[PDB]
């Protein structure tokens, strides 16, 4: 089957008393034993979907709670001047809990560890993590697209500001709309709009037709992640595009338009 069996794995959205509002899995070892995948596949996928444990219950963080956890992690790590290139769970967990004392702190050690396993890579020195900064930047940008430019467009300079304002002050990343290839289109060359690739036509002629209505000229790198799902012959993407559209290679940039 190749995937984890999430049948009994509940979604955690920051609730106060998770174990009572929830036939539970308590351990990742248990989940792997009951899953039709290898241990390495199961562990890797656990990290990508944001699997965690809360109140002894194996769970999966909701996308809203994962966003909030990453955001407070980044604010707190900058506020304590942690080394974003050498983070350990202990300092990071302490940094986020420092100013959460009078109420409910859902950001336990395991939640912190889930965020780091999703947005960071562990170094083969200590039990230490290095943030994947461009990946975090892209993930923020995707949230900004969905919130601000779902069904309407926005000038590029205004969008970049709203995108940048999600980061902690002094966060060491330069952002660039090219990070969001596969998640947006440019209705004009100075505006941007969100697009969800999952909702595009499964017929390639119809998909290219729809994409040229959104944007009459595409850089090949911009349209590629929106069409590659249909390239089942595995050919070079330029040859695939040439079957359904016109290409013109400029200097090094290829521009693609309808035929």
Numbering used by the authors: 114 to 135, 142 to 243, 246 to 380
What does the paper say about this structure?
The complex is required for activation of the intra‐S‐phase checkpoint and proper establishment of sister chromatid cohesion. Previous studies have shown that Dcc1 and Ctf8 are able to form a stable sub‐complex in vitro and that the C‐terminus of Ctf18 is required for the interaction with the Dcc1‐Ctf8 sub‐complex 39.
The refined structure was then used as a search model to determine the structure of the Ctf18C‐Dcc1‐Ctf8 heterotrimer by molecular replacement (MR). To identify whether any common domains were present in the heterotrimer, we performed a three‐dimensional homology search using the Dali server 48. A large conserved basic patch was present on the surface of WH3. This suggested the domain could interact with DNA as basic residues are able to bind to the negatively charged backbone of DNA. A gel shift was observed with both ssDNA and dsDNA, suggesting Dcc1 could interact with both substrates. Mutation of K364, R367 or R380 reduced the affinity for both ssDNA and dsDNA, albeit weakly with K364, while the triple mutant K364A, R367A, R380A totally eliminated binding similar to the WH3 deletion.
